Homo-oligomer: A and B are copies of this chain.
Amino acid sequence: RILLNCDMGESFGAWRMGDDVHSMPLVDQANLACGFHAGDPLTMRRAVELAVRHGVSIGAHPAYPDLSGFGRRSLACSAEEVHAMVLYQIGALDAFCRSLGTQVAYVKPHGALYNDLVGDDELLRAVLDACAAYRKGLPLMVLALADNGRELELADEADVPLLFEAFADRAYLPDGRLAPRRLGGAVHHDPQRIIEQALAIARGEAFPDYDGNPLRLTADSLCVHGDNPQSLAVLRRLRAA
């Protein structure tokens, strides 16, 4: 039923992020960095080889140009700037994919860019259009909400398929958005809390939001973070299914 995704290839130079070798065999979808928040060219090659080696679907994980902030800070870019930096990043990653006989299978924006799309029509249009410009049929992954009507409508105008994503290890606000990271309790560090939220989403059942009040979602893809070490050491919830 629901697919597991995970942000990977987020190492950079001599610095390691996550634990891609462990997480790759457990997920369906690898959202790989494209050098703007992480993932230098050699790291990118390695992330793709590792994904290819485990049969995992590769998404482009593009970000704002902000290495020191890990692409988790909103940067007030024009739609024109965003279109071009998405296109650039998709093509850079796809170069490695094709040398390894595969291709970029979807796009999942990283960090503040991903969250800025939830409230900004002009940025989502720009991102959708970059996807369509690159390849007919290339899906964009966006935040599942109770009502995804705005996203469905814009995706229709651009003729881009959408993948609706939910999160196992992030606290949700009442309004359907994710709790900002600049605030305690935004990431779940209780493994049992992560498992329960994940399975509530998998089943379309209510789960506790940030304030412990019930929130209901259904999603095509479920994100688990390799950054988060508890979400790592509990990742064998693939077996729960």
Which of B40, B91, B95, B112 is the one whose CB lies under 8 Å from A68? B40
Residues in B neighbouring A14, C-beta threshold 8 A: 17, 70, 72, 227
Interface contact B15-A69, CB-CB below 8 Å: no
CB-CB nearest 5 A-B residue pairs: A91-B95, A15-B15, A41-B84, A14-B70, A41-B88
If the complex has contacts A15-B16, A99-B133, A134-B99, are A69 and B77 also in contact, measured as CB distance less than 8 A?
A: yes
The verdict on A76 contacting chain B, using a C-beta distance below 8 Å, is yes
A94 closest partner in B (C-beta): B91
Q: How far is the CA of A13 from the CA of B15 in the complex (A)?
A: 10
What are 17 A-B contacts defined by CB distance under 8 Å?
A11-B15, A13-B70, A14-B17, A14-B72, A35-B88, A40-B84, A41-B85, A42-B81, A42-B84, A42-B85, A44-B84, A45-B84, A67-B67, A74-B74, A87-B99, A88-B92, A88-B96
**Considering the chains assembled together, what is the distance between the CA atoms of A182 and B134 in angstroms?**
27
Interface string of A215-229 (1 = CB under 8 A from B): 000000000000100
Indicate if A194 sits at the interface (CB-CB under 8 A).
no
**Shortest Cβ gap from A84 to chain B (Å):** 4
Known contacts A12-B68, A69-B77, A76-B112; A88/B95 CB under 8 A: yes
Q: Which residue of B lies closest to A89 (CB)?
A: B92
Q: Which of A44, A92, A134 has the most CB of B within 10 A?
A: A92
Q: Which residues of B contact A87 (CB under 8 A)?
A: 41, 45, 95-96, 99
Number of copies: 4
Segment 189-240 of A: residues with Cβ below 8 Å from B: 227
Alpha-carbon separation in the docked complex, A82 to B227 (Å):
24
In Å, the complex CA distance between A14 and B17 comes to 8
Beyond the given pairs A35-B88, A42-B81, A69-B75, 20 more chain A to chain B contacts, judged by CB atoms under 8 angstroms and listed by A's residue number, are: A12-B15, A12-B68, A13-B68, A14-B70, A41-B81, A41-B84, A42-B80, A42-B84, A44-B84, A69-B81, A73-B77, A75-B75, A75-B76, A78-B182, A87-B96, A88-B92, A91-B92, A91-B95, A92-B92, A98-B134
